[PDB]
Amino acid sequence: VTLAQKFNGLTVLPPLLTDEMIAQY
Amino acid sequence: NKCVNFNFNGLTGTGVLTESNKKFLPFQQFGRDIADTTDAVRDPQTLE
Numbered sequence: 001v002t003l004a005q006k007f008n009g010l011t012v013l014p015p016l017l018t019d020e021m022i023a024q025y
Numbered sequence: 026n027k028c029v030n031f032n033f034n035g036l037t038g039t040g041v042l043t044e045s046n047k048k049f050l051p052f053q054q055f056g057r058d059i060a061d062t063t064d065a066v067r068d069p070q071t072l073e
Contacts, residue, residue, distance in 0.1 A: 004058060007040070 033066045
């Protein structure tokens with residue numbers, strides 16, 4: 001899976017669980 | 026390196042101005058990103 005706009009007031013928020021916490025679960 | 030209101034030959038906005046590794050062609054005056062939005066500019070007196 002493969003994945004700027006901030007001058008337009010768009011913002012991307014991080015998930016509560018990190019990819020290490022998902023890997024632990 | 027400071028947040029400023031800028032006006033470059035009429036191109037007006039607000040942002041922090043930084044040195045760039047982008048090389049424009051001789052006649053190009055400002056640069057745009059994928060969403061047709063300005064992210065670089067040429068300074069008309071000293072041309073960096």
